[PDB]
């Protein structure tokens, strides 16, 4: 819910630096993806509504115990709000931040062999929306510059024209690019339209709506930080300053 509320490249990247990798993984076994299922949607129909389980739903699913599965779980957390079930990774990797896993060689993970075609295919990209695609392209760009595969990233974008049109423009090593970027990456927020407490047919839409109504409850709760009222109560380390920049950028 917190990750899905980030609306800018600065806020999203700042959140990924603070959060550790254990948030990306989940310890609930869940079910398996790519399975045709019959779910119950009684507000609309009496029969059982068919659908297909995927990795993009907000429910935890069993994942493969490899580097490919780890990256899919990280991107799933960013674009959906929940990750997968990959246990016994190791406390050394789980303490490090999501950004460090994505763009630092010191962690020890090897991601050079990863192919963006199957990752996009597995993390079903024909079913994503514009905001979800932009976040995935951010993760691909961060990984590509980590292993020096910028040329491969460009060729992949040139093959898929719609991805190129919405691809965010920022250099992973430069902080000026993050500041200048004005893409909207928010999947949840205060809605201008009328948001009701009703169900949606698809698994993806129902889970997304639950996060949206959950954010409204959290926005009006006591855990939210109203800057206009209590800006002098935050500590100096976490106060918003223009001089602030990501570590190593």
């Amino acid at each position: 819910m917190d990750v899905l509320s980030k609306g800018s490249l600065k806020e999203l990247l700042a959140h990924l630096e603070k959060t550790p990798l254990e948030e990306a993984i989940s310890y609930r076994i869940g079910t398996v993806p790519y399975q045709n299922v019959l779910i119950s949607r009684n507000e609309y129909y009496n029969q059982l509504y068919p659908d297909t389980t995927s990795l993009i739903d907000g429910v935890s699913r069993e994942g493969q115990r490899n580097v490919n599965g780890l990256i899919m779980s990280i991107i799933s957390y960013v674009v959906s709000g929940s990750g997968h079930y990959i246990p016994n990774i190791g406390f050394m990797l789980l303490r490090r931040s999501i950004l460090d896993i994505l763009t630092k060689h010191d962690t020890g993970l090897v991601t050079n062999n990863l192919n963006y075609g199957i990752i996009a295919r597995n993390l079903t990209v024909s079913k994503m929306n514009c905001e979800q695609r932009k976040r995935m392209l951010i993760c691909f760009k961060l990984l590509a510059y980590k292993d020096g595969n910028q040329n491969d990233y460009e060729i992949y974008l040139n093959q898929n024209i719609p991805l190129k049109q919405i691809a965010p423009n920022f250099i992973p090593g430069d902080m000026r690019t993050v500041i200048h970027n004005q893409d909207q990456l928010a999947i949840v927020g205060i809605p201008a339209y009328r948001l009701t407490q009703s169900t949606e047919l698809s698994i993806r839409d129902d889970n997304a709506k639950s996060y949206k109504l959950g954010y409204v409850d959290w926005y009006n709760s006591n855990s939210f930080l109203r800057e206009r009222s209590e800006f002098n109560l935050i500590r100096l380390k976490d106060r918003d300053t223009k001089y602030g920049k990501l570590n190593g950028w």
């Binding site: 509504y49 719609p162 928010a186 047919l201």
Partner: protein, 298 residues
């Protein structure tokens, strides 16, 4: 033994999965409502002897005042409506319109995107299969009124099986000459011109005598839940306008003569319930498109 099927029921292509949530549904409802005011502004302009009513209507629809040196296009909502319609038809079409733009346009007017508060009648007759024995010719022509031509060149009478699916509510059969029809494992009645039957009952056997050809005309009625603002006449015109403009021109998709055939063909897919909801939302978007483009041709 040969089998025959309706042409429009063959290989429905997958539909889009985006722009189905509440905010996007309210965008389509707002677009339909505001595009309707655009058409009515013409009659207000005739009565008021001035273009002010039209200018007000277009300003709300496009966020910009009309110009004389510019061709009126509709602005952001026209662009958003066009791109959203493309995504609905095929899963291969990109989802270009951002969510933020959809929410901003959905806040222009107060509507509820409930697409399950009414119903409509769709007249496409589904013939999933027609099984005939040897020395018998069966031809299925038509989509709104299906005519089945049957010829028995064999020595004796033949039994031909009909399968109308499990979705259509009623089917009425009218023959050129009186004929006999009964369900499976049932006795045959006296020859009659007209039969009314429920496709859910089961496959139907029709007795074909040897001689002149027998032609049966099939008319079916199906009920699909649609929003209260649905208008079949406007939706049908919007379907033809969008096809002419090339909004459906995308690789690896099927082409249908009318919106009636499109929705029924999708409903008879492997999991047709999943696609009915998207098709109805496409109908409301097409109804908005027909009104918007007729007021602002381009």
């Amino acid at each position: 033994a040969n089998r025959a099927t309706s042409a429009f029921l063959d290989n429905p292509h997958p539909v889009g999965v985006n722009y189905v949530d509440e905010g996007s549904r309210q965008f389509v409802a707002v677009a339909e409502l505001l595009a309707s005011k655009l058409i009515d502004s013409s009659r207000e302009s005739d009565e008021s002897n001035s273009d002010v009513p039209f200018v007000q209507a277009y300003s709300k629809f496009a966020d910009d005042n009309p110009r004389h040196l510019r061709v009126k296009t509709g602005g952001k909502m026209a662009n958003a409506l066009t791109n959203v319609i493309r995504s609905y038809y095929s899963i291969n079409a990109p989802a270009i319109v951002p969510q933020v733009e959809i929410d901003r346009l959905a806040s222009k007017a107060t509507v509820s995107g409930d697409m399950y508060n009414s119903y409509a009648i769709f007249n496409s007759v589904p013939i999933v299969e027609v099984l005939s024995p040897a020395r018998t010719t069966v031809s299925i022509v038509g989509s709104d009124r299906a005519d089945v031509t049957m010829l028995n060149t064999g020595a004796g009478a033949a039994n031909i099986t009909f399968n109308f699916g499990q979705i259509a509510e009623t089917v009425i059969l009218k023959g050129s000459v009186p004929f006999q029809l009964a369900r499976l494992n049932q006795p045959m009645p006296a020859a009659r011109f007209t039969y009314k039957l429920r496709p859910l009952d089961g496959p139907f056997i029709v007795v074909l005598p040897v001689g002149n050809p027998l032609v049966i005309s099939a008319t079916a009625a199906t009920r699909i839940q649609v929003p209260l603002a649905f208008n079949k006449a406007l939706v049908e015109s919007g379907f033809q306008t969008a096809m002419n403009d090339g909004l459906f021109d995308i690789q690896n998709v099927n082409y249908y003569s009318s919106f009636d055939e499109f929705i029924i063909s999708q409903y008879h897919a492997q999991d047709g319930i999943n696609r009915v909801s998207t098709c109805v939302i496409l109908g409301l978007a097409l109804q908005a498109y027909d009104q918007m483009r007729r007021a602002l041709p381009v």
